[PDB]
Every structure is written in structure tokens, then in C-alpha cells.
Amino acid sequence: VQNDEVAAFCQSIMKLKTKFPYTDHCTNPGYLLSPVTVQASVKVSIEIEGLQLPVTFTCDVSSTVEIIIMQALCWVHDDLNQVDVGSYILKVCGQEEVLQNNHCLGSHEHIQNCRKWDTEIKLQLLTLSAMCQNLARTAEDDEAPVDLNRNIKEAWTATEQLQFTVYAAHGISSNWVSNYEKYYLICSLSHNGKDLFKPIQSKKVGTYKNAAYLIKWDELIIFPIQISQLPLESVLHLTLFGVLNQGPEALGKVSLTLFDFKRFLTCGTKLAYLWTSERIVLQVDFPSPAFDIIYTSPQIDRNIIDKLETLESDIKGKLLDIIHRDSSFGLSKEDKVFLWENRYYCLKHPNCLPKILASAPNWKWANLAKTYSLLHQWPPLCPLAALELLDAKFADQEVRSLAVSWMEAISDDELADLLPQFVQALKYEIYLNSSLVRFLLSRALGNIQIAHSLYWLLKDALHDTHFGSRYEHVLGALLSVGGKGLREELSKQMKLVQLLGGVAEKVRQASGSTRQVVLQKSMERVQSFFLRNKCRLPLKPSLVAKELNIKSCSFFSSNAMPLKVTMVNADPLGEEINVMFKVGEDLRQDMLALQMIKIMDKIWLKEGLDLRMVIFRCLSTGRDRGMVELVPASDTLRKIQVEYGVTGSFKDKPLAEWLRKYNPSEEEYEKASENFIYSCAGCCVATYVLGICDRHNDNIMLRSTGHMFHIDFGKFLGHAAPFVLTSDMAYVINGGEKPTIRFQLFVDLCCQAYNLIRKQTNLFLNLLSLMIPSGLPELTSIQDLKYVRDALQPQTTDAEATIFFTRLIESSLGSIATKFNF
Ligand SMILES: O=C(CSc1nc2nccnc2c(=O)n1CCc1ccccc1)Nc1nc(-c2cccc(O)c2)cs1
């Protein structure tokens, strides 16, 4: 049946492939699209063929890339009628990414970065023919097949009790036989991620006589449930325990779906695989009658429910209070029961559907008809709201598929920064083929960035003990449907990272003197690689490295010695590529913190608030290793303070003098100090809301332009000053020892941004919830989310929330807070 599920998946993906022909350029562009985030004049320089100097001109940020292309065309051509405006595109110099014509110049992320750093905006005008499209799919790609490397009784008429005999575990290890004397299983039955009944424990039995590799229970297990009472998505969990010989110690876990991908109840012997990480086979024998049991969903209920009593005796106000509540998190039982009665009065508010669904009394087969009738007349949800319908608490195929149908309204650009949570949501689909995985694969088909990011996220997801096989099939489908070009580039990137990681290991394994000469020798391997391959940068695949710059490659001195890898651009119009490669730390936590910060930045920009945040990249390439973006011309606060100490003129001047050294002009220092004010406000809000703690001087970094950012996120969602404002940071903000209206601006910015994040409390809780199953040390349960919820204070109004955050700023000032009038 599993092989049949794989085959059905493959053939469905063949269908999906037909939906994306290689001829269609917008689905198959062959190149990365320059990212856009929706949100004056700036100077752009555009290189044009046949001109020795690029044309530099002032463009409106609001103007679209299409008309900017035409403006450059107008520079070189006095009449644009003869030339074709079509078949002309703009790329970033040095980066193999194409600006999107319909979108505004200001909306492009590269433009926004250059504006913040005051970097020269450098573009190239070229035809589609000149653009590198080596990633594009071929006719060979479209034609190739997909490779990932009798009577019937309806279930509602099925009286039999769910039962099965746990037979045996086969292939147990020597050290297992050494360490434990008996074994037993805990059997749980669940739906929507919750137990339907209390778990039943097997008897404790030792290894079978004459068969040490075998544990034989041969034990029947009967649940107090009836086949007709089992939801379609019912899952049986079997956890193995060993008792030590000298508490019980968990050895592994298995899951079995109670109905297969064709809705047939599992019957007969089914084998399951427990990975010690070594494969143990577990045998579960299910009843096998002379007939097949099929699940049949209930009969459709059709109603137009509109024209009902609106007594509204304070009850409408109670309903709106529940509707306009922040999230489903913590919703009272009584509130649940009456949101469920008055669910048909909430159609006017679509994004409250999860709450309603979370307040269903049960998912018994009978009530399913009315639930589905409501779902199919429900208004479309915001994609972001619809995420919640893909978490574990909603297993129902109808709910989830219709959530994905609402989700299909999301842009690729917005989707890309959300990909990790989707990769995780795959875990709550019990079948291989599902609307969610098809949605992800189709989005990857049409967008090279989506495909690339999915690839790396699936490679991390593989290391899951329980879900590794599912992710292996998903990754195989992705690599198969991506095409030959995409695949070979991904293989080059995989080889590059593996080589870099080897170099990292060797650098830490050597000591002192040796460590500097081993780096040059280890790197010769890499340079051989570059001799035979041009390879795209895994952190930003728009950058192509032709060759390693050995002499600029070094190592940072830290607990884990990171590698400063400098490579030369394949494009002479580009800059040299600088990344850090770190091994020995789980970068997935850092990535989550960075993603949360970035999403706050997006939320702020959506309401027009620009806190000038440094948004840098981090990629977990393999287990406990990866590439991190390097921010140029920036230091930790430690370093600034110690360098200043050599002079030691004042505790309040170290940040000021540093910024003044890199910004000598009075206008320049004011510009850099304003950058500090805004970025500091953003960092303070992000620190308090994410529970970022241990913000020591090393953790804080400051850019020469004046922007403040965070680098190490070891304390994430930690519990207990919320943030710390030292005297020299107050000096930069005020511009003087005494307080100025610039500090009031700082406070205003903090409180404004804080309230903007509170408005999106549901989004943030959902994103962290969906990362729960990924297995980071500080995000294991819903209480970890309750910390963030409490930090966001949803019940309070914006006014009292401002009061609260302002008191936080005073506590952060601490001893020097005497000098301020709130
Ligand atoms: O100057 C710098 C600042 S060091 C730095 N920065 C980071 N940034 C983001 C994330 N983590 C870090 C980071 O951990 N550290 C190390 C800080 C540390 C040092 C020594 C011991 C312990 C800790 N970085 C560089 N940038 C470039 C460059 C040039 C041109 C373009 C470009 O994109 C980058 C070359 S070197």
C-alpha cells in the first residue's frame, strides 16, 4: 500500500508537471527574481550595451521597473517606437536576479537595502537573450518521468472495536540487550494532535528465548472505541520503552494511520520501522475480515444560512469581544461554547474561522456534515490567518485543503520568508500526497527562489528520526520536478558546503600556529573545486563564485572558530562575495530569530514605519553548520568600548567617537545617530517581544553607518531588565548628555512599533507554534508561546500598552533614568 501511495504521488506530480510547460517563460524563467516587499527619488546607474559609461539618472522610487527600463531606453534612443521595450530587463550588477517589471523600484529589497546603507544603486539593462537561464527546465525535463531517488463495509456501519496485537520488535542491538532487561510499548490513539483516549500500556517482556534480536509480546490491545467512532485522520502511536537492569527510557516511536491513502481501514499484518540512529522492525497485526472497511465522509448538508434573530442582548457585544480577540490562545470554555452557537453570526468576520473551528465540541462523524456545510459557504481567509488551519490541532482533510485554497492567494515573495513553517506543517499531513505538498511543489515549479529555499529546508528536515522518510520522498519529488539544470547547480552548492565544512572542522582541530597554515592547505581542495566549477552562493544563489580569494580568507577568533570565506564574483560588474561559515552550532535557532525580526520589519514597513533594521541572512546547510551573511564595517560594542578605553575620556563617548570617526561631518554624525535611534528602537521591541536575553556587548553589533543589530541568539524565548540602555547609547540618541526631543522620538518609535506588532499577535503565535515540531531547545510547548503572548499584552489598549513599554524603557535606563521626565 505504501508503494501504491508513492506511485499515486508520482503520477499526480506528473499531472502537476504538465501544468508547468518549459515553454512558458513566467513559470520557467531560468533565473532568480529579485525579491519585492510592499511598502521620494534615488539615483540609479544602468549599464547599457555599446556605452562605455553607465547612464546615471534620478528615478522616482514609486515608478515601476517597466517605465524605468523605458527611461534608460529613452536616454540612448530618442524615439522608442523603433526599439522593442519588450525583451528588455534590468538586473542587479553582480547578481543573477531580474527586477520585476510590474513592481515599484522602491518595493525591491535590493533598492531598500542600498537606500539604508547609502550604497550606490547599480543595475544593468539587457535583453532576455543575454540573461543567464542555465537553471531553466528543458523539453527533456518535461518529458522525463518522476523518480523519488471483495465486499466493502462502510466505516460508519462498522461496529467492531479498534483492536490489534502488538506482535514483536525484530533486530534489537547488542547494547540494548546489555542495558535493559524488559521492554514495553505505550499505545496512544490521537486525532488533531490530541489523544482520543488515555494510552494503553503493553506488558513488560524480555528478549524471546534463543532470539536475542527479537522482543515478542504477541499481545492483543483493545481500545474503548468502535471503528465507526474513528475520524479519518486517526493515528496510532507506539512508543517503545526499556527498563534498566543495573527509570524507563524511551527507545523510539512509531505512527500508523488507521486509514490508508484510499480510506481503507488498515487490516492484517503491518510492519513499521523504528530508527535508533539502525532499523528495528515492529509488527502490528490488525484484524483481517473477509471484507474491506472503507471510510465514507458524511452526506452533504446544503443550506444558505442571513435571516436569523439578532436579539443582541449584550450577547452581540460579547461575540465581537471574542471575534476581535487576539488569538484562539487561552480562549475560555464558556467563550468556546457560545462562539460555537453563534458561529453563523460570524460569517461577516472571516479570519475568526480558526477560533470557531477550535471551539467545535467534537469531530464526531455526525457533526461533520454541519461543520463542512459551514466551511463551504465561508468567505475566503487571509493567507496569513489560514496558516493556523495547517497546524496540528486541525487534521481534517477538508479544513486543511480549503486552508490551502485560501493560501493560494499569497505572493511568492511573501511565501518565501514563510517557507520553514510550511515545511514543518508537512508533518501534520498523514498522507504523502496532499494539497499542501502539491501547493509547495507547484510554487517551487514557478519560482526558482522558492525551489532553492525548499531544497535547503528539506535537507534539514531529513534529520528527523520520525519524519525522515516522508521528507525524503518530498525532496525527491522536488529535485525530480526541478529539472536537470537546477539539480546540477544544487549539487555544486552541496559539494561546496561539504568542502567548506571539512575545512572548518580541520581549522578547529588544529591549534595555534598550525591553525593558520592548515587553512591555506585545506582551502586548496576548494580551489580545485572552483577550477572545475562555477558555483552559486547558497546564502544568495544570485551570486556566482568563479574562484576563491585565498589571501582574504581567514578565521574569526571565537568559541567556535568561524571561517571568513572571500570569493571573487563571476561577474566583473559585481563585488566580491564575503560569507561566514560556522560549524559546531545549531543555526536553526538563529534562523528563527532572524526570521521573526524580519517579519516584524515587514509589518512595520506595511504601516509605513521604517526603523532601518539590518536584515541579514543565515542558512543551515547541514546539521549544526552553515553560512551566515557578513555585515560590512561593523563591530561589537565590546570592541568599540575597549578601543575607546585606550583613551578613556568619558564613559558616554565610546559609541559617539566611533560613529564620529566613520561619520566626521556634523550632518553625517546626525544621519548616523538618527540611524542608531531608529534601529535601536526596533531592536528594543524585538528583544522584549521575542524574549531575547543575555544581550551582552558581544551580542550587540553596530554598523559604521550607525545601525544597531543582534548576532547571537542563544537566549531565545527565555524567561527572566527587558532590554538595557547604557549611558553612551542614550548619548547617541540625545546627541548630548542632557535629554532632547530625539529621545522622545525614540520613545514614540518604540511604542508605535510595539503596538504594530501587537496587532499581528495571532500571526506571530502561529509562526512560533508551527516551528514547535522542528525541535529547538526553547520551543517545545505552547507555554513557550504563552510567554510571547504575555509579552504582547493583547487585552490592553494601545494607550496603556504605550505606558507599559515606556516604563520598560525607564527600567532599561536604570541608574541614569534619574535624568529623564517620562
Ligand atoms: O566586518 C565585519 C564584522 S564581523 C561579524 N559580522 C557579522 N555579521 C552578521 C552576522 N554575524 C557576524 C559576525 O559574527 N561577525 C564576527 C564578529 C566576531 C569577531 C570575532 C570574534 C567573535 C565575533 N564582517 C565583514 N563583512 C565583510 C563584507 C564585506 C563586503 C561585503 C559584505 O557583504 C561583507 C567582510 S568582513
Residue numbers in the entry: 3 to 41, 49 to 158, 292 to 388, 402 to 432, 450 to 477, 480 to 894, 905 to 1006
Please give sentences taken from the publication describing this entry.
Phosphatidylinositol 3-kinase type 2α (PI3KC2α) and related class II PI3K isoforms are of increasing biomedical interest because of their crucial roles in endocytic membrane dynamics, cell division and signaling, angiogenesis, and platelet morphology and function. Class II PI3Ks comprise PI3KC2α, PI3KC2β and PI3KC2γ isoforms and are unique in their ability to directly synthesize PI 3,4-bisphosphate (PI(3,4)P2) from PI 4-monophosphate (PI(4)P) in vivo. PI3KC2α contains a compact PI3K catalytic core (PI3KC2αcore) that comprises a Ras-binding domain and an N-terminal C2 domain as well as helical and kinase domains and displays a typical PI3K kinase domain fold. The ATP-binding site of the unliganded apo form of PI3KC2αcore is located in a cavity between the N- and C-lobes of the kinase domain and encompasses the (1) adenine-binding pocket, (2) affinity pocket and (3) specificity pocket.
To explore the structural basis of the inhibitory mechanism of PITCOIN1–PITCOIN3, we determined the structures of PI3KC2αcore in complex with inhibitors at maximal resolutions ranging from 2.5 to 2.9 Å. PITCOINs adopt nearly identical positions in the ATP-binding site. Their pteridinone scaffold occupies the adenine-binding pocket, while the two vicinal (R1 and R2) arms that extend outward from the pteridinone moiety display specific interactions with the N-lobe of the kinase domain and cause the inhibitors to adopt a propeller-shaped conformation. The pteridinone scaffold of PITCOIN1–PITCOIN3 forms a single hydrogen bond with the backbone of V1187 located in the kinase hinge region and embeds into hydrophobic surfaces provided by M1136 and L1186 at the top, M1257 and I1267 at the bottom, and F1172 on the inside of the adenine-binding pocket. PITCOIN2 and PITCOIN3 are distinguished from PITCOIN1 by the presence of bulky hydroxyphenyl (that is, PITCOIN2) or N-phenylmethanesulfonamide (that is, PITCOIN3) substituents on the 4′ position of the thiazole group. The space demand of these polar and bulky groups leads to additional hydrophobic interaction between P1188 within the kinase hinge and the phenyl group on the R1 arm of PITCOIN2 and PITCOIN3. As a result of these alterations, the mild off-target activity of PITCOIN1 against PI3KC2γ is lost in PITCOIN2 and PITCOIN3. Interestingly, the terminal hydroxyphenyl and N-phenylmethanesulfonamide groups cause the respective phenyl moiety to adopt different orientations upon complex formation of PITCOIN2 and PITCOIN3 with PI3KC2α. The hydroxyphenyl group of PITCOIN2 faces inward and is stabilized through interaction with the solvent, whereas the N-phenylmethanesulfonamide group of PITCOIN3 forms hydrophobic interactions with E1131. While PITCOIN1 was found to be a moderate PI3KC2γ and PI3KC2β inhibitor with IC50 values of about 1 µM or above, PITCOIN2 exhibited selectivity against PI3KC2γ but showed micromolar activity on PI3KC2β.
